[PDB]
Design a protein around this ligand. Sequence first.
Ligand SMILES: CNC(=O)[C@H](CC(C)C)N[C@H]1CC[C@H](n2cc(-c3ccc(Oc4ccccc4)cc3)c3c(N)ncnc32)CC1
Length: 447
Amino acid sequence: RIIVVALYDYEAIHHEDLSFQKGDQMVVLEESGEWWKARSLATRKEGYIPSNYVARVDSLETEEWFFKGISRKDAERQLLAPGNMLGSFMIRDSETTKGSYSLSVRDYDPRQGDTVKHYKIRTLDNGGFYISPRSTFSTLQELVDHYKKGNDGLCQKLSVPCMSSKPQKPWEKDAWEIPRESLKLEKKLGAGQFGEVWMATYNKHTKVAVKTMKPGSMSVEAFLAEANVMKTLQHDKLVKLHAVVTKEPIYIITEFMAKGSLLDFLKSDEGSKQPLPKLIDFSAQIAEGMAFIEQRNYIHRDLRAANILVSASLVCKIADFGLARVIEDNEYTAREGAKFPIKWTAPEAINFGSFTIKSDVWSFGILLMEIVTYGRIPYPGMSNPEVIRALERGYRMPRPENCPEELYNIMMRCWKNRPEERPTFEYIQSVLDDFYTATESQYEEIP
Ligand SMILES: CNC(=O)[C@H](CC(C)C)N[C@H]1CC[C@H](n2cc(-c3ccc(Oc4ccccc4)cc3)c3c(N)ncnc32)CC1
């Protein structure tokens, strides 16, 4: 008997889904995938449930102020989102002390502006918790109630839990290769060289995006082989690949991203007004996604701002990872013109077809420049031959206005002519994640 309790409200969408009042209790039967088979004790109706809507009855996951499965950086982004107030907080699993916890608190001061401060919650050997030795607690709930009453050494008195929203429904069971009839294409979002993108509805209940590839552009078997790898590249900063239609014209079904391409967003009324530290955060998010791709020994091949998508909450997600590999070169695709962009591509990829994670690093440097110029064409005033010849002679784009020198230094590292001399995305991710807090302590040393 493994027992869980519902967190959010969820109703039937598929064959056998159940009732989810905000506080119903159930027993887990099976645990394969993100959909769990389970039986309820309330009115005892049965079927399948979304695992991310439930939580173990004795676990901290039931608490409003506990955020399971997020990082320190995630925590900071979430707390700094609009709608949160001074003293907004969360408790999360510690990233640097396994089994222990961390408290993250939204702070403000006129010098540093909006920040998030982090505290180590230590566990007592015989039970309980403390941040400072003079104030111990039997439960994390007692700790929270204590610091809601007064700061007692913290940067702020705790106010309310970090705002959150009901998570995405997990994708339907075993609906990887889906029938084309399951999709109603509702709005064409754009047309490109080798296909179109539509907003669509999947089986009357789920909003998705559908990339519709032109006949002649891809092979079903080649595409599917690659797509079966793509779908496993699951990370908060990569766009989620839900499903495919494995018949020409091949369809690629992904999560819908409300603010479209980062390139378009940077050139929009709203995006053109993002302050520099937000631009840096965008850059960090993309680098986190690319560090994942690097860790997974994968290659993007066409990294640039056009292929970054932006969510309604301004989360950046990498799209089209690996796709260029399975776009075919034939009479059909040739009729369009110009497969990959010279100004974004590493010289060894151009010259020899050597695409690697290091040519992606080169491209990332170009993307950084796209970001800090709000979407300007790379190498303004230069033709493609001019770019290639200048690069060969050690020319690189100069630092533009409103670009921190350290950011430009990262670009210059990305643009080493020898690929082995370019940094790892693991390195880039670390320097961008800590861009403004490099000389600052990890956690607050509270007395
Ligand atoms: C004037 N501006 C325009 O015309 C610009 C295009 C320019 C920025 C170049 N117009 C474009 C701007 C991006 C728009 N777009 C593309 C995708 C997408 C991307 C990749 C997908 O497939 C994948 C394949 C492999 C791995 C991951 C995903 C699926 C959907 C997408 C989405 N999921 N949600 C929302 N908008 C999306 C479409 C119209």
